[PDB]
Amino acid sequence: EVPAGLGLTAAEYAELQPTVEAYHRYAVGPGQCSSLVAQRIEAPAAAVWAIVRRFDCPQVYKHFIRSCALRPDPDAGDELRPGRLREVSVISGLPASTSTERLDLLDDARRAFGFTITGGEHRLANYRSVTTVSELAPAAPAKICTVVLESYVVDVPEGNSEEDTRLFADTVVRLNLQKLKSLAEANATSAA
Template identity: 40%
Template sequence: MNSVAVEAIAKYHSHNISSCQCGSINMQEIGAPLSQVWHLIRKFDRPQAYKLFVKECFVLVGSGSEVGSVREVHIKSELPATTSIERLDELDDEHHVMRFSIIGGDHRLTNYQSTISLHEISDEVTMVIESYIVDVPLGLTKEETCAFIDNIIKFNMRSLAEKIARFV
């Protein structure tokens, strides 16, 4: 792990995880300038711009780009849910950090909190780091819960990299 990632994890991705929770950190280098990657990531009101499991998104509270905004995400049928209600907890354009929480929906992700941060590796390479914590649902193990969420995040990161590669 390079020093940029180590510093970013220490600064933005340290979570206090209780005994009934699990969490993980996922990283992906993307061959594009930080500004291009941030342009897509920061659009809280348009997660479907790169998250392929998202069918559509509606802003319920706020503008979609201000802290406290709430969105309703409609999920494609490949996942065991149809909607997720999510709140934007932080959007820091200077440090390229976004935090959001899942506050409702028809899924089993309770107390889900995610942090996404971007870090410039070079003029043409950006490191995306996404971490989360979540309660482990009854009947599942920590490993099963994290494996499920990690797979979705990794898929979203690959999708982001592919989307940006088409425009670079």
């Protein structure tokens, strides 16, 4: 029952399906499309999640982001609560110059993250994203495998097709996850 084109095996998806059925699901309207991307990372689940949970600094693992600035505190000092907004700057030439994104879900216990795009300069509208970090622990002593799942839903512009939009989003998402992998694996190598 593994969704087509995912990148995860049957044994792996069987464990992750509760996390898939809980955090990654969407109601897709005629002018919308959704997708789900998986990334395997060889690194502890805490290290990967520690990078992902930082809403203030997405430019660390996110490929096309030159700089980012977080909006000042509406009465929350030490912790980033859901409802916070950030303003993201993107490299030149891309469909988007800049984006304003809001924190939707941050759960440290269940290791789930999410955010929505409100406004800015870009073609993609109403982009909702959910990122979960999951640990697959072998009963016998094997290497560490952490699986990151990131799903989204987005509106398709009237001039753009569904593939062209989805291919673009999948591309950005995977470059983000490949960087997160590269980063967390280099950090997990030096520590022990």
